[PDB]
Amino acid sequence: FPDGGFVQVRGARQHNLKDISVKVPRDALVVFTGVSGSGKSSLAFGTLYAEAQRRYLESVSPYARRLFNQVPDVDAIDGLPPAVALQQARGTPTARSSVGSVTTLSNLLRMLYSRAGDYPPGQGIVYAEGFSPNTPEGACPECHGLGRVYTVTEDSMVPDPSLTIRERAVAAWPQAWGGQNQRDILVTLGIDVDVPWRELPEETRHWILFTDEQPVVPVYPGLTPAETQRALKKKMEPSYMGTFSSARRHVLHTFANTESASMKKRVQGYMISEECPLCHGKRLRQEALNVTFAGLDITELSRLPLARVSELLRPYAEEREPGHAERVKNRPEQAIALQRMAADLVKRLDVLLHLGLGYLGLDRSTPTLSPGELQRLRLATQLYSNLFGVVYVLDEPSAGLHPADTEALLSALENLKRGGNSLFVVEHDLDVIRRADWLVDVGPEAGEKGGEILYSGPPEGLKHVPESQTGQYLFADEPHTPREPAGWLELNGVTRNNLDNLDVRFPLGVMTSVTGVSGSGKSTLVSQALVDALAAHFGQGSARLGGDLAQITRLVRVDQKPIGRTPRSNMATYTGLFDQVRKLFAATPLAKKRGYNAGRFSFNVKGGRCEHCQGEGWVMVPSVYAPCPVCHGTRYNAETLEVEYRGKNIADVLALTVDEAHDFFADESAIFRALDTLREVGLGYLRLGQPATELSGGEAQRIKLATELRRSGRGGTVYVLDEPTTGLHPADVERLQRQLVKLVDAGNTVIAVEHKMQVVAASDWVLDIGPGAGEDGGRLVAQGTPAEVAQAAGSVTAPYLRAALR
């Protein structure tokens, strides 16, 4: 590290950051550490990314991104090169988009299916972006590339095919006159109403149901068919003149033109999700599906794992593909480019693969990727992206990563950097922290008591800081006797993805860690197959339950996913905490004296809230959340704020930290109660009205948990939860474990997917999955007490577990 090889930050203040300074070197693995909530993000993304983002955008687009003056709070940053963020900003959704498109590979075999690729006799050429499901030319024009449709069929419009038409055999039709009209139209149109439906010929039932036709026929109502037929022949004067409307035509048109509650509803009852009948779920025009390569259309290829895709092309790159012989001389132009295309396709593929992302299929949909999977995908994609001289900002690239592969990751970082780039990574993985060139560690604790720089330097240096929470877990190096299973629950013959008719069993009233290499199949076992089975069986693919079911009654399930989308929702809203605070306000002399309803203090309904914001407090103006205008951040009008409980109005308490709220609501029973369950979950740092789209999702998780951690009034529910270590510093996982240890004792089962061994080591039972990932996975390598799995042969995880028990 040469002097003036550094980035110089002075007076950073953003959020809890306590007006601090840091030098951190460019061209190095700088790892940003410290307790959750402490300040790492507000340093790494709040200041460095944010600032560097901005000085650049204003130079590139003096157009109007500069014009957009409404900055991070920071006096100075010297030596800051342009930045690239590999995890999108907190308050954003994820765009709807595929693995292959994130990684660009999708576009690149699109080019390939075009130049190369086997055109059938006599039909032209299909341009690159006509093999895409998201371009007008490429997508099949029915489903629009989605591959699904949402419509009508025989079985939905006739749930009981044995009725006569007169009997309303055609459930999807109108009720009073509407059904009458048509029913009558049919008899006039020489069709017998009075046989059961199933009795009727093909393209008749199909006509009756589907036809976009609408003949206009004389209708003689309440006459018998025999006579209706005769009086037609006499050309006798009708009673009116009817328009026929195919069952489908009603149903759809209705869905398209009503503002009616049970109307739409009852019509959606003749509507089921089923695969597009044009393209058969393969997402593209027949003209694009017509083209084939290694005997596949591109959809087919796209749904293979990257790992196989890397194999399928591999010959072509090396010119050793059976057929190549009778292809070089008889077609030059392409065979040179085809090689190159494949050659280059493999080259990239391979970097992905070396990150063991080999199991993802390129059509896989990024909303359904995890934080890690995705970040590591981005990390791979950048490794060939070709940027030089930038700082990549990373957010726990090790999320999900299993301790054996941490070396492949530690590698891709070394390679990015080795491309003349700089690396800012916030991390908690002691294995990642261990190998970084340079550490920087944040807060002592979180929030108000955080946001100071405890130490910026090489990581060994932390040795000399007694009071760096991460100083300990990193440096200063009671075991666990598994508890007796109170009974067993079986999830049998789960066939899905990876998994194939796998039978499996989890012990009740006790901890289960389901370990295994990343992609080995934890989540489709435990967060997919298991969770569904259990919620189908209770109130709320094609498995069966079995075993001691009567012994469990509920299923709380703890996403990483956010507590809500809009600033509408927020931490108070979500827990039930706000209803008790609105209740309290409506109870005051002042509210009682005025007309005021309970929840005139809702910023979510008309009345108490100011009209500009119609509630929110944050008016949206990358796409970023700059606060309100002319309520002035509050969310409420002048009166509703006039109501004060012990000197604090509604907005006054919403802008209140749980710690302060706990002080405050001291003799207010089920509030001071509810607050403890966040204070214990460790959230004492947060505003009650801090919107959902600002919390770390690690945070979000802590809340959903905060909920159940006192509802357990009768403990016999199952708690299944994906990555509980989500975004927790070591010190944090300890306080986590604590809270689970508790909620197991009140007789509760907790199946937890888990890559960190620390917490597995403490489990009561373990299940190792796969042996490796993808197709090399989906099998049960080992189960039993940690000590028992820790000595198992087959498993990849056993030595790290053994490591973590000694």
Next chain:
Amino acid sequence: PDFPDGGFVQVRGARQHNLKDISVKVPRDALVVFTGVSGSGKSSLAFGTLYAEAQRRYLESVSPYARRLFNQAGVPDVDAIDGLPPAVALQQARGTPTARSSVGSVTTLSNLLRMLYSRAGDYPPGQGIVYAEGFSPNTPEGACPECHGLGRVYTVTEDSMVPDPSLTIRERAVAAWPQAWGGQNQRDILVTLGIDVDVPWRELPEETRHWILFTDEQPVVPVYPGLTPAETQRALKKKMEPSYMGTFSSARRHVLHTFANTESASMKKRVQGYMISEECPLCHGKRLRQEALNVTFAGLDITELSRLPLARVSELLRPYAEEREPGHAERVKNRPEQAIALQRMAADLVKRLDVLLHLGLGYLGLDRSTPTLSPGELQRLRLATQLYSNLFGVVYVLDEPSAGLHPADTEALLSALENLKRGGNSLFVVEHDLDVIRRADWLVDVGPEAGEKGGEILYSGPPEGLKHVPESQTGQYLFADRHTEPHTPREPAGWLELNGVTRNNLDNLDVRFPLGVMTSVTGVSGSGKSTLVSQALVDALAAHFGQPVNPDPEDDEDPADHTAGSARLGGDLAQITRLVRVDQKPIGRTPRSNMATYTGLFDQVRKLFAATPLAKKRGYNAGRFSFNVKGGRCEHCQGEGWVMVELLFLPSVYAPCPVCHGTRYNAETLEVEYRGKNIADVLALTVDEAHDFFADESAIFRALDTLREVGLGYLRLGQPATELSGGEAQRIKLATELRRSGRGGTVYVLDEPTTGLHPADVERLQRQLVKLVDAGNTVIAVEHKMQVVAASDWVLDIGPGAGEDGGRLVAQGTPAEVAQAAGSVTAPYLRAALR
């Protein structure tokens, strides 16, 4: 004598435009400069390839879904670049419009001082805080409410709307109304509601001819198009289905709407002719809320401050920043919170402003429209801004930052360049200026000549090295010894006065240009030259002739950004018959406009294809070969051959038409060949190929010749106006004057004519002007380049300095003479260049 290892940017396999599939190492951390004659490919490498790829990479990495798809353009054609940091370009791209900004805007400073006026600056007793965003005409808290922040109110009036009231409505007497369908559409709606659409406008009763022309009303009437009022009424009686249902909208409404609701340039305009526009009675034209206007700084309201020169601005604001303000003590004690904010705030603007000022920029006013700056200016402003703008680790890419900079002030350009780099960055700089070049760190010199005859890398290495590269033209000029090739100044054949010129700097200046004789107008940057030559003299001569010069397909100025300041002529005007200015403004602002068509030579091409076997066999005339009318032309693009991408968020660019493929023509027509050649194939031809191909064809060869001798050998007959540099556009203009001059006595005004001209191109440009001075004609030209000032027959030396220390006629006479002048700044540079 040493640039560091692997700290070179490595290019490989760059076959961009003409670029002959090349490779160059270019050190980072250095003032690198790119050289070569106009056409050689330096913009093709430095922008076009190196820059262009730094973005393709950097944005794709920063919105890896968004940008990506939008490489509906971006295939820089190169195999590899390594060591390429991310880039910032300072010229915006070729055929990109300047979107309308101001100095204060680009420099950031405007925003910087709403912020001073809000949080300090004098407030009247009543008034609470006006926030910063309330001192801008673009906010609701800013804009004066009566005129909506514009400056002025617009009402609409029968006389404007309908100028000739004798015409039948059906024959279009109501010019306000929209063209085409939308026209006849409101008409057919009238005939439906029983309105006499065929008896002179002035003949209807006031009420009904008022209502239409003025109402805020919308009757949803049935309309049957194609049918006379008589057979239209008996169609409404018998209640049969209408073709369409048609909403009506008063002529008012349409005209108002259209003004407030088009992104469109040439449509917001088309309605201005039907709008009377007073200054805003409440605004007094300043664009803002009376509340803002109440707040003062050192006497002036923000608008007042905003018209001042950057030099004045800092001049009046420095006292505040050093705390040497008059009555500081009395301000800090009774006001300690704001006085600290006031100095800190002041001193940051002064700081920004000296950068602005050290590069000779103080002559400019914060409120000057950017579309009226010269590129030399807003690039030097853009450089300017950058220095305090704080970026680190980047490649700046500059296109001739010294355009229009007088010799005296290069040292200035030259340490903004130095300073910027020393902020941790890379500059690359396309450059014809020998004194910049001589001080570069690395040089890339390009293809021995232009187009096909260039796009090579003759050399790349430090400066002294070009010494040894025999085919480098820039080499020749950078190292040629003092060429004692002295010019013998031509005798004026007359004299022309421009007396009492008052505008910008110039206050009653009296000056005389000799005639039939090349005169250069030299002067430091900012001093007066343009306002005197391209402004003052031209309107003075234009108004003296019938023709107000400027074609009608071309406009000029968003009503007000230049001066009325007039002045009066006399001398020998009896000897002048024509005015002809030549500027770097495009032959066209869209691909519609190519070279062939700007000359007129295309007509005779079209006619040629009309006498083939095909053109007889199917009914083909010149017109199925025009690309500006339907028929033989392709219609997906409309003959333009090109489509835009306003979806690309940053400055929208142009992509080949997807249907016809940059060709412009329906296939059926591309089958017609002339002497072995398509119609697209000829549009594709170079100037040197076309010469060959049409040797006999006299009407073409002729116009082609003037193009070749004017330098443009390498441009293509159909090469979209928008790929053209301006320095090439300028040269085009000139070719079509040479051509129609076998006469005498016109006066050519040339606003900087060595725009983006290598010393070898200029040398051939002179030759070319000398041809029309020998013809009797006069040429006047503002000039920054002592080379070409040497050749002249008369120098006028302007200002002393720029702006307020300028506007004077400090010296004059022959070059030989003027190089001896008293207080001329150009004085010693001529003596230098004369020897």
